[PDB]
Every structure is written in C-alpha cells, then in structure tokens.
C-alpha cells in the first residue's frame, strides 16, 4: 500500500494491495469490478505518460523563449510559418495534420493490437531497468506518482491561463513579485464575489 | 437532582448513565431532541465547541473594549474593527479569508475524522511524530498531550470541576454575545455604554423604554 | 402448525392481506389443505377480518 | 417560499407524529375519530424542532420503511 | 542519567537511562514510542551539529570584521566576497551548486537508515575507540549542540529586536547593562 490516502479511513475491499501506488483511494467505489479496474489501470498510466510529455514540452518552449504553449497554433490559425527551435518548417499545415494523423493511427492501433500490454520492455526497454522484480515495482510506483503529478500540473496550467491569459512563467513571476497581489484570489476570476 | 424546573418530570432519554454522566445536566430538553443517543453525543460535542468559541470571542470583545475606556488600548468598536483593520491591513480581504479558510478546514477535517472513528488519527506513519499524542483521551472532545499541556488532567479530583466550569462559562458566553448583538441592533452604541447608561439610571434605561423591544407601547 | 393465537405473515399474492401479518385463530390437526385460520384487524373490500390459508402461504412473523 | 416550506413541514411532521403515536394503542379507529387533547398539545409544542428531528431520523435511516408494503400481484 | 532535569521530579518511563545526555526531560511525554524517539535522537543530534556550524560562521565573520550574518545576502539581494577574496561567479550559479551539493549529501545521509555515528573514514582521527569515553564525548557533543541551538535563537531574537550585530549587543550591555538590555530594549515586553 502506497499509504492510507486518508488517515483514519478504511480501505476498500476491491483494491488488491501490492500495486504501483495503491493508496486505496476510491471513496466513490468505481473499480469494484475487475475488467473496469484494469481499464482504469491502463488509462491512468498512459494518462500519466502523456501528461508528463505535455509539461516537458510546454515548459521547454516557454523557458526557452519561444512563446508559451498557447502561442504555437497562431502561425497556422492565421497566415504564417511553422517554426521549431528557431528552425522553421517549410511544409503544409494540412500536410503535418494528415502526417501526425496517420502516425498516431499506426501507433495506437499497435497499442490496441495486443490487449493490454502496458510494460512492453525488451526492445521498448533496451536500457533494461526493470530487471529487479522489486525495484521494478519501486520504479512503477514512482512512475505513477510522476504521472498523476504531471496531470495535475497540466490542469493547473489550463486554469491559470484561462483566468489570466498568461504564460505560467508569467504567473509564477507575478506571484514572485507579489504573492498577496498575484494570486487566484487577486485574480478575482476564480471566485465571483471578490 | 438539580433540575432546571423543580416539580417537573425528567425527560425519558435525559436520564441515563451517559446523560447524567455527560456534564451540566439538569433534565433540560423539553423538545426531546436527545431521544436518540448518537444525536445526543453529537450535540454534546457541538455544545462543547460552541462554549469554547463563544468564551474566546466574548473575551476578545470585552477586554479591549473595556480598556479602550481606559487611556491606553484605544480600540475602535468591535462591529467596526473589521473596517478599521482592513484599512490598516496589507493583504486583500479575499486572500485573507481564503487562506484562513484553508487552515481552518484542515484542523476541522482532523477533528471530524476523529469524531467519526476515535482511534483514527493514531494511524502509525500517517505523520512522522503526530500519532504518538494524536490519540483521544478516552473522552471525545478532550484531546491530549499538547492539548492540556500543563498536565491539568493528571488530577482527576479536579477533573469534574474543570468540565463543569467550562460548560457553565461557555453557556454564559453564548448568552452574553446574543445580548451584545441584540442591543447593538436596538440602541446601536457601545456595550459598555449601554452598561453605563442602565447604571446611571436603571428605572428608565432598559428595553422597556427603548420603544423597540416592545413596540406596541 | 404453530400454536393458536400465534402471529404469522401472509404471503399469498392474491390475498388482500398479502405481505401483511395476522393472528392465527387455529390450525386443523387434520389434513385439510388450508388448516390455517388467520384473524385480522383491517377488513378487505367486502368486510371480512379472517381468512384461511395453507401451511406454506404464511410465515410466523 | 422559505417561510412557507418551514411552516408546511411543521404541520406535516406533527401530523405524522400524531398518527404514529395513536397507531400503537388499543383503538386506532377511536383515536382517529376522537382526539386526545393532551396528546395533541404535547405533540404540537414538540413539533417545533421538526427539521432537526427529521434530518436526524434520516441520518439513522428510520423514516423510510423496508420492503414490506401491501403490493399488487405483479410487483 | 545526565542528571535530574528537575530536582524532586520523577523520571519518565519511556526514557532508557544510558544515553548521551539523558537528563530525563520530556514532561510533555513525546518520545514515549520507540521509532518516534529514535527519530528524535537523530533530529536532535544533526540539529546540534548544524547549530554549532552556524554559530562558528556568524561569530567568524562578525569578529573578523566583515559585517554580521545579516549582512552577507546584501551584495546579491541588491559581488560575493569571502575573507576579502571576492567571488567572480553567479548568484544563481552558487544557488544551484549548493543545491545539488546538499541534495547529494543528504540523499547519502538517507541512503542508509539512521547511521548517526559513521566513524571509520568519517572519523579518520578515531577518537571513539574507548566505548566509554566514547559515551563521554557523545554526551559532551549533545551538550554543545543544544547550547549552539539556544545561542542561535538568541542571535535571531536580539537582532529582531535591535537590528544589531550580536557583538554590538554585547558591547552595548558592556557599556551599560542597566541601559542595554531586553527590558530597556522596550520591545520584548509591551508595557515597558
Ligand atoms: C486523492 C488524494 C487525496 C485526497 C482527496 C485526500 C484528502 C484528504 N486528506 Mg489525505 N488525501 C489524499 C491523498 C493522501 N492523503 C495522505 C495523507 C494525509 C494526511 C497525513 C492527512 C490527510 C488529510 C486529508 C484531508 C485534508 C482536509 C483538507 O485540507 O480539507 C480542505 C477543506 C475542505 C472543505 C475539504 C473538504 C472535503 C482530506 C480528507 C488530513 C486528515 O484530515 O486526515 C484525517 C491529514 O491529516 N491526508 C496521503 C499519504 C498516504 C495521500 C496519498 O495519496
Ligand atoms: C462570521 C463572523 C463575522 C461577523 C458576524 C462579522 C460582522 C461584521 N463584519 Mg466582519 N464579521 C465576521 C467575520 C469577519 N469580518 C471580517 C472582516 C470584515 C471587514 C473588512 C468588515 C467587516 C464588517 C462587518 C460588518 C458587516 C457584515 C459586521 C459588523 C465591515 C465593518 O466593520 O463595517 C463597519 C467591514 O468593513 N468585517 C473578517 C476577516 C476576513 C471576518 C472573518 O471571519
Ligand atoms: C530543559 C531544561 C530544564 C528546564 C526547563 C528546567 C526547569 C527548571 N529547573 Mg532544572 N530545568 C532544566 C534542566 C536542568 N535543571 C537542572 C538542575 C536544576 C536545579 C539544581 C534546580 C532546577 C530548577 C528548575 C526550575 C527553575 C525555576 C525549573 C522547574 C530549580 C528547582 O525548582 O528545582 C526543584 C532548582 O533548584 N534545575 C539540570 C541538571 C541536572 C538540568 C539539566 O538539563
Ligand atoms: C483518468 C485517469 C485515471 C484513472 C483511469 C485512474 C484509475 C485509478 N485510480 Mg486514480 N488518479 C488519477 C488518475 C486516474 N486514476 C490521478 C491523476 C490522480 C491524482 C489525484 C489519482 C489519484 C489516485 C489515488 C490516490 C488512488 C487512485 C486509485 C485509482 C484506482 C482506483 C480508483 C473543477 C484506479 C486504477 C487508487 C489506487 O490504488 O491507485 C493505484 C488510489 O488509491 N488514483
Ligand atoms: C503535449 C505534447 C506536445 C505537442 C502536442 C507539441 C506540439 C508542438 N510543439 Mg513541441 N514539444 C514537446 C511536446 C509537444 N509539442 C516536447 C516534449 C518538447 C521538448 C522536447 C517540445 C518542445 C518544443 C519546442 C521547443 C517547440 C515545439 C514546438 C511545437 C509545435 C511544432 C512542432 C507544435 C504545436 C515549436 C513551437 O511551438 O514553435 C512556436 C517549438 O519551437 N515543441
Ligand atoms: C499544481 C501546481 C500549481 C502551481 C504551482 C500553481 C501556482 C500558481 N497558481 Mg494555480 N492553479 C493550479 C495549480 C497550480 N497553481 C490548479 C490545479 C488550478 C485549478 C484550480 C489553478 C488555477 C489557477 C488560477 C485560475 C490562477 C492560479 C494562479 C496561480 C499563481 C498565483 C497563486 C501561482 C504561480 C493565479 C495566477 O495566475 O496568478 C498570477 C490565477 O489566477 N492558479
Ligand atoms: C477570540 C476571537 C477573536 C477574534 C475573532 C478577534 C478578531 C480581531 N481582533 Mg482580537 N483579540 C481577541 C480575540 C479575538 N480577536 C482577544 C482574546 C484579545 C485579547 C488579547 C484580543 C485583543 C485584540 C486587540 C487589542 C486588537 C484586536 C484586533 C482584532 C482585529 C484584527 C485582527 C480582529 C477584528 C485589533 C483591532 O480590532 O483593531 C481595530 C486590535 O487592535 N484583538
Ligand atoms: C447576557 C446577559 C445580559 C446582560 C448582563 C444584559 C444587561 C442589560 N441589557 Mg440586555 N439583553 C441580553 C442579555 C443581557 N443584557 C439578551 C440576551 C438580549 C436579547 C433579548 C438583550 C437585549 C437587550 C435590549 C434590547 C436592551 C438590553 C438592555 C440591557 C441593559 C438594561 C437592562 C435591560 O433592559 O435588560 C434587558 C443592561 C445593561 C437595554 C440597553 O441596552 O439599554 C441601553 C436594552 O434596551 N438588553
Ligand atoms: C399528516 C398529514 C399528511 C401527510 C404528512 C401526508 C403525506 C403525503 N401526502 Mg397527503 N394527505 C393526507 C394527509 C397527509 N399527507 C390527507 C388527510 C389527505 C386527504 C385525503 C391526503 C391526500 C393525499 C393525496 C391524494 C396525495 C397526498 C400526497 C402526499 C405525499 C406528499 C405530501 C403532500 O403533497 O400531501 C405524502 C404521501 C401526494 C403524493 O403521493 O405525493 C407523492 C398525493 O398524491 N396526500
């Protein structure tokens, strides 16, 4: 058990213990059924991975000084040119559209070919860091931790920018300059009567 | 026993080991709201918290309010100190209320998980050192260790008296606060001022002559 | 069946007293199909307060 | 609307309590055709805290009855 | 037992006797549980060591005449210098540097469970080879540690009142004790 998600609470029965990050948190009793719960496992893990990739990218462009994540689609949603690390891209919007389309189609159709193999390893782990069978579980737990964190981070990004219309770097810099003046309360948007 | 109403009969529920053993009991529940024991215990806890907070608040009102009549500690009225302090402040009242809300919600969650299951917060490892003294003192509503820091509980011959004076002073505090707000509506001046007025003349400084409490006259 | 004056719970679906409880007047020790006799205190749609039943149809509750 | 809801819940609750109290006696029809004055007065004066009493009953899950009602043949 | 922390008092049961500096002082009954108490041991000892380092440094700069401890961060909050030798490197540089350094060191401290007295390579001078005088030195160590902690707190309180270097505070009390004291400070007590 990753820990009692709520001190003093009681564990739900349908949650088997040894499981990467099994905190026992499902007070609404969702995964009480095995197929649904396994579906939940795979959804959660791939969500964590994709979330992590998202934050990596957003922070990359933002702090590298190429606008924020909300700035990229501008070049194409209007007249302009795709650019990447300053290297521009001399190809069509619709081209890259269909391209990434067929790419994701192939990759996810592959993911669905086999049933539910979440931890492929072997060729997909050519560095081979799961050869412990216990520290493997350690890394699995740390993985899902990072995943849930990255998900929450992304949601925070979208909420902050839906309120302020600002890059997250700008948001943190504002809170730095004044926390009492740069906050969701001072934002005056997250709460109506403020 | 000591009954709020001599001659009256004791409520069915109110005469049980727990009730007679709770505190401050005088067979007073003519609405019988305690015909259920779980609800009764819950309401005892509620009354405890209310006694405590009301005592705290009435102290915070009277003491600076009394000493503003004294030279030093010149302090504005309590129903205006909100405006005064928010003027002298440094942070927006929104953020202030928000943060204090968070920090109160946390402690309330602790208290509540406890009242749900008494041995809830002694769960090993759930903190680093808390659970040691984070366990009830066998009486829901009297946490131990740091709570009661001066070892006043290790002397049971004073235990009942502490409980009793606590509940008595708490009920008095609630009543005084209600008097405060009522008179601030009726007259509108300082409580100490209403005091001094009724003292300078009892026979005519009173709700009986406010022309409001009893409007038909 | 249960001794006289005992209280049982009618369960015959058709019975006006269905899913209710009534007092057993008596049970025939002989082999008639419905030896149970059950008083009630709420007359049906014809003004009767006692009905007869077989063994199974009732539950002593 | 809030005032009406309060007073209506009051009336309904004191009615329910009278019905229940008189139901467990030796002559329900008689107590229904003729009223016990002391009982009526006691239940009236105690009808005050009816919202609290009702929410407590709910939290104990007592106000609702289990599946033992008279029921037509299909269900 | 280091001694009865309170004459006439009574010892708490959960305190085993032979222990560096076991005075028996826990009237609030905290370490009554073993894992918590061991946590307390390690916390207290590392606190003593870090406190001692702190006073060493503060007194060093102050009496060497390079400003007080409250003076160093000025150069960067608005060039870094050390013993008069300046430092030609970035604030953020030294920040990340000391960051990764402390990360490595404390991650090492946490790698093993609770080894507080490593010795061997970490005691290449080897002064704990007595097993009794070792306990003597342990006790003197924790004494020095609690003292340095109290000393640091005194530093911060004195300077929060006076805004002055501790050398200045003691010099003022020297010049006049009756006029340079927390009471004459008029800040530590309101009605003064
Ligand atoms: C899904 C994640 C998750 C959620 C929803 C909660 C939710 C909660 N935790 Mg838990 N925890 C969670 C994960 C974890 N907790 C902990 C460790 C703790 C501790 C140590 C404590 C809590 C406590 C709390 C409460 C904080 C009350 C509060 O601030 O209300 C904010 C205000 C409101 C109005 C919210 C009302 C709902 C709340 C019931 C505290 C508590 O009450 O414990 C009994 C507490 O002491 N949690 C661990 C480590 C094993 C978790 C791991 O994932
Ligand atoms: C729930 C308790 C509570 C009550 C009854 C009042 C009651 C009052 N406050 Mg106070 N306040 C209360 C809590 C608080 N007030 C404030 C902050 C303020 C301000 C800033 C002001 C008041 C003012 C008022 C008045 C109008 C509402 C009235 C005297 C106003 C006042 O004093 O007008 C003369 C006013 O300006 N209150 C804070 C801090 C966020 C509170 C936190 O719980
Ligand atoms: C945490 C430290 C600590 C605290 C809070 C106290 C607190 C106290 N000591 Mg103790 N002492 C402490 C450590 C120690 N005391 C003493 C030796 C004494 C003596 C000799 C006396 C006190 C006395 C006192 C009291 C002073 C008034 C007070 C109850 C005085 C007292 O009232 O004793 C009954 C007193 O006479 N203490 C020793 C040496 C073993 C200590 C070692 O750490
Ligand atoms: C949609 C994504 C997703 C999915 C499918 C799951 C699936 C699951 N979660 Mg949840 N979970 C997620 C995201 C997700 N989680 C995220 C992002 C968080 C962070 C708040 C959590 C935090 C969380 C905890 C703390 C726990 C679960 C647990 C679980 C399991 C039971 C519930 C205007 C189940 C496998 C329980 C478990 O055992 O997980 C291993 C459990 O204890 N989840
Ligand atoms: C959520 C994942 C995600 C998605 C959808 C995109 C999408 C995009 N990125 Mg990329 N990017 C990502 C992850 C992602 N990126 C990651 C993980 C990194 C770090 C390796 C970056 C770092 C990055 C940079 C530094 C830049 C892009 C840029 C772009 C745009 C052109 C390609 C496009 C909108 C370009 C852009 O937005 O130019 C204005 C660009 O310069 N990305
Ligand atoms: C978990 C990471 C995280 C972090 C580090 C921050 C940090 C910050 N947020 Mg928050 N925020 C987050 C998650 C986070 N937020 C989430 C999950 C939400 C959803 C409720 C939001 C929604 C949000 C809004 C809508 C706003 C902030 C704002 C802020 C900034 C002022 C406080 C501060 C830098 C304020 C801001 O941008 O201040 C400049 C602001 O307006 N945040
Ligand atoms: C227990 C409840 C309580 C609460 C909610 C408040 C609330 C407040 N007090 Mg405090 N106060 C309290 C108890 C309380 N006080 C007590 C017990 C004391 C005695 C030490 C004081 C003595 C006190 C003073 C002397 C002052 C405040 C002031 C204030 C205000 C700014 C903070 C605020 C309205 C300040 C104020 O009202 O400024 C206008 C102020 O100057 N309080
Ligand atoms: C808690 C105890 C308490 C105390 C010591 C006092 C004391 C006093 N009240 Mg009373 N009063 C209280 C509670 C209390 N009140 C409560 C709970 C209420 C609500 C019903 C009131 C409502 C009230 C009003 C409306 C008035 C007083 C007034 C007074 C003063 C004159 C006597 C009178 O009319 O009484 C009653 C006197 C100092 C009078 C006053 O303030 O005169 C200036 C006045 O007109 N009080
Ligand atoms: C103590 C008084 C009392 C109470 C608490 C109830 C309770 C109820 N009555 Mg009312 N009802 C009563 C006496 C009472 N009735 C009497 C004396 C009559 C006159 C014959 C009726 C006739 C009646 C009908 C015909 C209906 C209700 C309905 C209801 C329901 C909701 C309340 C309402 O709208 O009325 C509930 C079953 C309605 C219902 O079923 O709502 C779901 C409904 O259709 N009642």
Curated annotation (Swiss-Prot), chain C:
Q: Which key words are in the record?
A: Chloroplast, Membrane, Photosynthesis, Photosystem I, Plastid, Thylakoid, Transit peptide
Q: Where in the cell is it found?
A: Plastid, Chloroplast thylakoid membrane
A GO cellular component annotation here is: photosystem I reaction center
How the protein assembles, per its UniProt entry?
A: Interacts with ALB3.1, which is essential for its insertion into thylakoid membrane.
Going by the entry's taxonomy, the superkingdom of the source organism is recorded as Eukaryota
Q: Does the keyword Repeat apply?
A: no
For membrane topology, the record states: Peripheral membrane protein
Name this polypeptide is given? Photosystem I reaction center subunit IV, chloroplastic
Covered part of the full sequence, start to end and full length, is 36 to 96 of 97
| Primary role | Stabilizes the interaction between PsaC and the PSI core, assists the docking of the ferredoxin to PSI and interacts with ferredoxin-NADP oxidoreductase.
Q: Tell me the GO BP annotations in alphabetical order.
A: photosynthesis
UniProtKB/Swiss-Prot annotation, chain D:
One cellular component term (GO) for this entry is: photosystem I reaction center
The alphabetical list of record keywords is: Chloroplast, Photosynthesis, Photosystem I, Plastid, Thylakoid, Transit peptide
Membrane spanning stretches: none
Q: Which domain of life is it from?
A: Eukaryota
Indicate whether Translocase appears among the record's keywords: no
Question: A GO biological process this protein is involved in?
Answer: photosynthesis
Q: What is its main location?
A: plastid
- Disulfide cysteine pairs (residue numbers): none
- Where in or outside the cell is it found? Plastid, Chloroplast thylakoid lumen
Q: What does this protein do?
A: Probably participates in efficiency of electron transfer from plastocyanin to P700 (or cytochrome c553 in algae and cyanobacteria). This plastocyanin-docking protein contributes to the specific association of plastocyanin to PSI.
The entry sums up its family as follows:
Belongs to the PsaF family.
Q: Indicate what this protein is called per its UniProt record.
A: Photosystem I reaction center subunit III, chloroplastic
